[PDB]
């Protein structure tokens, strides 16, 4: 049984950052070759175990969380970082055991009048715990008036599109990023 | 930097169909609600149909129920207005229109801030 | 469904002079939450039709401030302090709260000149 990690790298829509897929892999052998040999992955960033020697190792799961970032971003991908996306978004374990892959998407991801469809959290009132991911909507009270379920003054939508324009700089384009936890 | 693109909408015959769509362009589509509001020629405003985010809730007004279908494609970014059993007195101007607000009590029928320009439907022999 | 009856169907008004919009409602529009949930709608000739007030007395993005919305329940009014020849067009009304969207009739600015 080959582990289905053709369905997550080679998956045709990805997942908003505050919205992050993970699937869960169970019973099955999987080659992890085919990844540190793809002139593909601008990043391959690995904590505790060493990325060659991922096919003599066992684990009793993997997880593999994929999303879409800005490339300025994949920094906060990591154990220890903090930034919008590690604060409200994603957020790593100080202990962590796995892999950070990611990739520019800018063909796949970004279009001319921009790309609105992916979308990041800009405000919550406290830090995400890690793996720890809120899907919610409620707008964000920022003043001491109640909001009444009502975007408005002071009274924000919770999520913010990136807008992915075609013709920025490295730095701006969306980049698609794969988690994989060895617990 | 927000705009909706209305197209289809012709001369349909009566008694037949026709499908209408509302290409959005400039903003975070995915997260508002939308609007279909109708003009008869030398009339008023009614409103026919409103769809929440990613589909799921619909609403209809009375004079279109069983016979339109509001959809929507959050994919690339078009709404959509299926017209079926076309009448006399669905002849109109239709456009799409944007939901103003996002929050609970917003309500996906309710304030449109963005209007398209409009699409022009004849129903005629 | 809720009735919005608009007062008057047709409106001449000096340049410069204010102008008043009546609009009343068969219920009212005042929700739990504080807000009387009343839109004003204008549609300029040859035009599509533009958010004016939303939730009966904020202004909508754009919109001058000689543009006024008040009143509470079911008796609301639109009031435009210096009226201008860009403002001659058509006036709605609208209710937000239940689903059967419902426009008053509209009301005709016209511009005494």
């Known amino acids: 049984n080959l582990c289905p990690f053709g369905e997550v790298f080679n998956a045709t829509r990805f997942a908003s950052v505050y919205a992050w897929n993970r699937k869960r892999i169970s019973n099955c052998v999987a080659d992890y070759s085919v990844l540190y040999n793809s002139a593909s992955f601008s990043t391959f960033k690995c904590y505790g175990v060493s990325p060659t020697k991922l096919n003599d190792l066992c684990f009793t799961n993997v997880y593999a969380d994929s999303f879409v970032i800005r490339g300025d971003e994949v920094r906060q991908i990591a154990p220890g970082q903090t930034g919008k996306i590690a604060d409200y978004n994603y957020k790593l374990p100080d202990d962590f055991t796995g892999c950070v892959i990611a990739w520019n998407s800018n063909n796949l991801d970004s279009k001319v009048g921009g790309n609105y469809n992916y979308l990041y959290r800009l405000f919550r009132k406290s830090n995400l715990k890690p793996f720890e991911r809120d899907i919610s909507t409620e707008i964000y009270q920022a003043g001491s008036t109640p909001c009444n379920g009502v975007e408005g003054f002071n009274c924000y939508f919770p999520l913010q599109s990136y807008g992915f324009q075609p013709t920025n700089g490295v730095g701006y384009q969306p980049y698609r990023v794969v988690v994989l936890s060895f617990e | 930097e927000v705009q909706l693109l209305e197209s289809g909408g012709g001369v349909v015959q009566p008694g037949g169909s026709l499908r209408l769509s509302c290409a959005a362009s400039?903003?975070?589509?995915?997260?508002?609600?939308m609007n279909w509001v109708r003009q008869a020629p030398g009339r008023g405003l009614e409103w026919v149909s409103a769809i929440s985010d990613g589909g799921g809730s619909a609403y209809y007004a009375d004079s279109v129920k069983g016979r339109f279908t509001i959809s929507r494609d959050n994919s690339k970014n078009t709404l959509y207005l299926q017209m079926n059993s076309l009448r006399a007195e669905d002849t109109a101007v239709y456009y799409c229109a944007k939901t103003r607000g996002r929050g609970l009590y917003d309500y996906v029928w309710g304030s449109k801030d963005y209007w398209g320009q409009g699409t022009l439907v004849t129903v005629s022999s | 469904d809720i009735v919005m009856t608009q007062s008057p169907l047709s409106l001449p008004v000096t340049p410069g002079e204010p102008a008043s919009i009546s609009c009343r409602s068969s219920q009212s529009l005042l929700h739990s939450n504080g807000y009387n949930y009343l839109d004003w709608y204008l549609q300029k000739p040859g035009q599509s039709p533009q958010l004016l007030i939303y939730?009966?007395?904020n202004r909508a993005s754009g919109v001058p401030d000689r543009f006024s919305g008040s009143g509470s329940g079911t008796d609301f009014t639109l009031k435009i302090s210096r009226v201008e020849a860009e403002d001659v067009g058509v006036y709605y009304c609208?209710?937000?709260?239940?689903?059967?969207?419902?426009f008053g009739q509209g009301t005709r600015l016209e511009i005494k000149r």
């Open positions: 939730l009966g007395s």
């Open positions: 400039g903003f975070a589509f995915t997260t508002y609600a």
């Open positions: 609208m209710q937000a709260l239940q689903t059967p969207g419902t």
